[PDB]
Ligand binder design. Structure first.
Ligand SMILES: *[C@@H]1O[C@H](CO)[C@@H](O[C@@H]2O[C@H](CO)[C@@H](O[C@@H]3O[C@H](CO[C@H]4O[C@H](CO)[C@@H](O)[C@H](O)[C@@H]4O)[C@@H](O)[C@H](O[C@H]4O[C@H](CO)[C@@H](O)[C@H](O)[C@@H]4O)[C@@H]3O)[C@H](O)[C@H]2NC(C)=O)[C@H](O)[C@H]1NC(C)=O
Ligand SMILES: *[C@@H]1O[C@H](CO)[C@@H](O[C@@H]2O[C@H](CO)[C@@H](O)[C@H](O)[C@H]2NC(C)=O)[C@H](O)[C@H]1NC(C)=O
Ligand SMILES: *[C@@H]1O[C@H](CO)[C@@H](O)[C@H](O)[C@H]1NC(C)=O
Ligand SMILES: *[C@@H]1O[C@H](CO)[C@@H](O)[C@H](O)[C@H]1NC(C)=O
Ligand SMILES: *[C@@H]1O[C@H](CO)[C@@H](O)[C@H](O)[C@H]1NC(C)=O
Ligand SMILES: *[C@@H]1O[C@H](CO)[C@@H](O)[C@H](O)[C@H]1NC(C)=O
Ligand SMILES: *[C@@H]1O[C@H](CO)[C@@H](O)[C@H](O)[C@H]1NC(C)=O
Ligand SMILES: *[C@@H]1O[C@H](CO)[C@@H](O)[C@H](O)[C@H]1NC(C)=O
Ligand SMILES: *[C@@H]1O[C@H](CO)[C@@H](O)[C@H](O)[C@H]1NC(C)=O
Ligand SMILES: *[C@@H]1O[C@H](CO)[C@@H](O)[C@H](O)[C@H]1NC(C)=O
Ligand SMILES: *[C@@H]1O[C@H](CO)[C@@H](O)[C@H](O)[C@H]1NC(C)=O
Ligand SMILES: *[C@@H]1O[C@H](CO)[C@@H](O)[C@H](O)[C@H]1NC(C)=O
Ligand SMILES: *[C@@H]1O[C@H](CO)[C@@H](O)[C@H](O)[C@H]1NC(C)=O
Ligand SMILES: *[C@@H]1O[C@H](CO)[C@@H](O)[C@H](O)[C@H]1NC(C)=O
Lengths: 131, 460, 131, 131, 52, 52
């Protein structure tokens, strides 16, 4: 997914492919996440769009994973969530049924990421105080 | 040795843009009650330290006639005038026939009496009442030669809405701040004729005090020029563009009235009350505007010698406006709460032939110019807003100690081989006033991103 | 030329000086991007300012330049965009002429930077998976 | 300070305490800021909340220490702002009266931090372009 | 003086209790001193997001 | 015939029907026979799939 050239498709036009080939289609497709009584409704839509985008950015910023797209951490992946091989996941599976299979086990992952970031910040402060 | 792309954030560049601007007013207009003019409940309080910065090498291209600020101000003032007439008395039951006679035994001759039949607070009963209406507000409702049946001029097109007599029409100055991420430039050049490059572009975050006065000819209170008379026009070839003259020295104008007795409270419906003119105690005199003679003469001569630059070997002449109704051909304004419509046949009666005439007389300043004014109450300024505001009358005498800053001339259509081009005054829409005031400013959009090549290659 | 005296430049204060003295003044110009008929013209302007600042910050943060002002990328500069010397660009102009001569060639540059950022993140993931 | 453990309250519970227990409490404090006539106030509260959050993050991001919660910077501390000992400041007073003593010189400190960050990034670009 | 608008017989004037909440970025200071006469310093100040 | 302008109130005129000139005939709509017949036949053969 690199020989498209003219990128105007968003996240709409790359789903259904394998997630190994769908991890290189993120940049302009994530750039597309922002671009009387009718005026108040439109301005409420603008405010909720800004609030949703900043909630996503705050969720990236809590567990030390901001400013990056492919951003991988040191939380140990529990085998009870997936129980399947990595080659099948990254070669014979799309993002949609992965979201269907992972949606029941998201909050535990988020809490583990937050705890790991708190431990890493404590270790960073200890290393700053050591030197 | 090679070149690589390097991203800078905080770059000072501009594109043209249109946006929505603020309102900033002084802090003294907020300590009073609600609904004084427009700005007590709405505008932000500006800080008493306007930061003006001069840019060094910057030359920018301005355009006075292609501006969004004038159209935005016109829309805002139209919306404000339509909003301020919403919780006010709508005088619908005053469409009845008015039985009018003369005002007395050789009395007023300008205001009729017009006793009518009105509705009291109880809709079963009626009571006989009276007022004093002005002559331009009444039309002779008659299918024959009947001199006693009259009606108002407003019950033929669209209703009215009486202006609430607790707000005032005083022009409090308002500033136009720019939103964050936008800037307002300001051309500080001296010979700036409205269009062209400016070599002294400055930084203003919120414009100066703009008084939204309403006038057709003879632009009242406002900012002057700085070193000489400056003439603003679009083309100066076709005779359909309103040439605007910006004066350098003001000329004093004062206007007066006789003494009405009081406003008369007549009750209509459940609690509504319109105020009408009662008696006129004392004698019946005229409302007139006074302009000094020598100051107007050498002001008009200086306008002539500044207008002779654009027309090399032609004389400059002036005469009256080119006919029509009283709302176009007369200098109309609004201060004291009472509208004026003043004739201007004595001001613009003169000529210039290229030879200067000095006026070396200081004891002859007693001679002045009087203008016969007329006063209306049913007001039809702006088309498409519901222009049937009824201005309520006011009690005492009034005085108009005012200031002139400009003129709105219009060149006449010349004949064949003419050398006597005549300039007539003209009114028109309010964009001429608010473009004579907002000629300096221009709104821009800041784009902070920017790329440029250098030797910086990012380390992997 | 870091010494301007009074630091009040307000989006514009060094728009005439050369580019060598205009890369030292980015903070005072980037500081101000955020800070009834007239009760709604005030409130729409805050929303559009937040929208424009968020769009600029997202577009800066896609290609790796997270919070840096003078950020550097590894996209090779094509010679078919400027055809001028380096010192001539950095000495004989200000930013306005450069914006006038670059404004046709911006979207290709943005696409190249986002593609290079995706390549950098993929290579960083592969290098961190090598260990 | 950090030994609270069960931290669901947050807010400003360290107010009025010693700075030694108020500077090392930031590892466990984190942040909880974003944790009809009544439909026009929800909107205005939401706009002022998102504006305050974006203003705070922008001010933290100009002088280049985004997402750290403690920034050591090399702006030299002028003696005319304190004229006094460091140990009694860090072991005798609270943050409120320190803010009351320091509020006359916040803008000069902020300008010094912005200038030092811009000088840091220019020196970083030069040193990284030497190679 | 004025004109009535008759209250339409489907709304009720029952005083349903409401809580006034500060926006995100503000706090409400609440004094828990039992002998507080209205004006003066407090000593058991507690911080709550919303009123009672 | 032309809408007859009847003026009521200040500038709130409403337009009612004036006369009728000429003879008086009936308003009607026209659909062809063959197109409607075989359209209904095709609707029948595609509704025969859902009912045996
Ligand atoms: C161009 O510029 C001129 C110069 O400023 C403006 O002229 C002013 O116009 C305003 C109104 O448009 C005048 O204000 C009015 O003054 C009346 C007389 O004031 C004298 O008497 C009072 C005591 O009653 C003294 O305090 C004062 O100092 C004067 O000695 C007042 O009677 C008016 O009061 C009305 O308004 C107040 C508040 O709204 C109400 O409480 C009252 O009941 C009443 O309704 C009013 O204050 C002002 O005097 C004029 N200036 C001068 C120097 O005369 C022009 O309006 C301006 N624009 C145009 C288009 O020409
Ligand atoms: C306008 O006409 C009315 C009605 O004719 C005048 O009001 C009358 O004034 C006389 C005093 O001269 C009273 O005796 C009457 O009782 C009044 N009639 C009323 C109250 O219905 C009024 O004076 C006239 N206007 C002027 C300016 O003279
Ligand atoms: C109003 O005055 C009296 C009282 O109702 C009534 O007889 C009269 O016909 C009415 N109309 C006019 C025009 O006087
Ligand atoms: C009354 O209105 C009509 C248009 O509706 C206009 O032609 C006429 O001139 C108006 N009457 C007067 C006296 O102006
Ligand atoms: C530009 O205008 C400012 C206005 O105060 C003035 O001080 C300055 O001298 C002007 N520039 C030149 C070159 O005259
Ligand atoms: C208006 O100005 C343009 C530009 O100078 C000119 O070409 C045009 O002839 C002018 N219009 C008239 C009516 O002369
Ligand atoms: C002004 O206009 C009138 C109107 O026709 C004309 O008769 C007159 O000659 C013009 N000039 C002067 C100086 O009055
Ligand atoms: C103005 O004055 C002149 C002469 O004084 C007169 O002929 C004219 O009718 C007056 N009115 C208007 C509207 O011009
Ligand atoms: C105009 O000026 C001339 C010369 O002063 C004078 O005779 C004349 O009466 C004035 N008025 C008119 C309406 O022509
Ligand atoms: C008219 O009103 C003014 C108020 O500005 C006052 O000075 C003047 O004396 C009044 N005129 C007369 C004749 O009393
Ligand atoms: C008009 O000119 C006079 C004369 O100097 C001055 O006192 C007055 O303030 C001016 N008017 C305004 C609104 O500035
Ligand atoms: C304006 O141009 C002159 C001429 O090179 C230059 O010396 C000056 O520094 C420039 N102004 C600014 C503010 O850079
Ligand atoms: C008073 O403040 C100190 C902080 O220096 C704190 O340790 C102490 O517990 C406080 N006193 C009480 C009674 O809470
Ligand atoms: C302060 O308020 C808390 C709230 O529960 C209470 O437990 C405590 O006893 C109070 N302290 C004093 C001194 O009243």
């Amino acid at each position: 997914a690199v020989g498209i050239g003219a990128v105007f498709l968003g996240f709409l036009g790359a789903a259904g492919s394998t997630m190994g080939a769908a991890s290189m289609t993120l940049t302009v497709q994530a750039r597309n996440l922002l671009s009387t009584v009718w005026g108040i409704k439109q301005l409420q839509a603008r405010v909720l769009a800004v609030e949703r985008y900043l909630r996503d950015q705050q969720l990236l910023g809590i567990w030390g994973c901001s400013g990056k797209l492919i951003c991988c951490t040191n939380v140990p992946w529990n085998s009870s969530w997936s129980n399947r091989n990595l080659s099948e996941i990254w070669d014979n599976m799309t993002w949609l049924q992965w979201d269907k299979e992972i949606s029941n086990y998201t909050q535990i992952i988020y809490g583990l990421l937050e705890e790991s970031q708190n431990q890493q910040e404590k270790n960073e402060q200890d290393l700053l105080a050591l030197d | 040795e090679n070149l690589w792309v390097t991203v800078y954030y905080g770059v000072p560049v501009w594109k043209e843009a249109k946006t929505t601007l603020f309102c900033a007013s002084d802090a003294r207009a907020y300590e009073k009650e609600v609904h004084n003019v427009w700005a007590t409940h709405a505008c932000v309080p500006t800080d008493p330290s306007p930061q003006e910065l001069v840019l060094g090498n910057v030359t920018e291209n301005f355009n006075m006639w292609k501006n969004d600020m004038v159209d935005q101000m016109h829309e805002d003032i139209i919306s404000l005038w339509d909003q301020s007439l919403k919780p006010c008395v709508k005088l619908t039951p005053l469409c009845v026939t008015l039985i009018c006679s003369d005002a007395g035994s050789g009395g007023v001759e300008e205001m009729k009496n017009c006793s009518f039949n009105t509705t009291t607070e109880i809709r079963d009963k009626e009571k006989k009442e009276y007022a004093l209406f002005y002559k331009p507000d009444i039309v002779p409702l008659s299918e024959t030669n009947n001199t006693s049946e009259y009606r108002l001029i407003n019950c033929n097109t669209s209703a009215c809405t009486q202006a609430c007599p607790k707000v005032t029409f005083e022009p409090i100055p308002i500033h136009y701040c720019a939103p964050a991420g936008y800037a307002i430039l300001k051309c500080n050049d001296e010979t700036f004729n409205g269009t062209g490059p400016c070599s002294n572009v400055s930084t203003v975050q919120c414009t100066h005090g703009i008084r939204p006065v309403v006038s057709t000819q003879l632009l009242l209170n406002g900012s002057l020029a700085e070193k000489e008379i400056v003439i603003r026009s679009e083309n100066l070839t076709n005779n359909a563009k309103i040439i605007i003259v910006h004066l350098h020295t003001p000329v004093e104008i004062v206007c007066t009235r006789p003494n009405n007795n009081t406003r008369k409270s007549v009750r209509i419906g459940p609690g509504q009350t319109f105020y009408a003119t009662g008696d006129i105690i004392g004698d019946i005199k005229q409302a007139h505007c006074n302009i000094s003679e020598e100051k107007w003469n050498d002001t008009l001569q200086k306008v002539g010698i500044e207008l002779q630059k654009h027309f090399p070997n032609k004389t400059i002449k002036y005469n009256q406006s080119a006919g029509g109704d009283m709302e176009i051909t007369t200098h109309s304004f609004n201060c004291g709460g009472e509208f004026f419509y003043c004739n201007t046949s004595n001001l613009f009666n003169g000529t210039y032939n290229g030879t200067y005439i000095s006026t070396n007389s200081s004891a002859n300043s007693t001679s002045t110019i009087t203008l016969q004014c007329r006063i209306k109450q049913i007001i039809n300024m702006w088309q498409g807003v519901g222009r049937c505001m009824y201005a309520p009358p006011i009690a005492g005498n009034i005085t108009c100690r005012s200031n002139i800053t400009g003129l709105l001339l219009t060149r006449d259509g010349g004949t064949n081989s003419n050398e006597t081009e005549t300039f007539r005054p003209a009114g028109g829409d309010m964009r001429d006033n608010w473009r004579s005031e907002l000629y300096k400013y221009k709104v821009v959009k800041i784009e902070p991103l920017g790329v440029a090549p250098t030797r910086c290659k990012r380390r992997v």
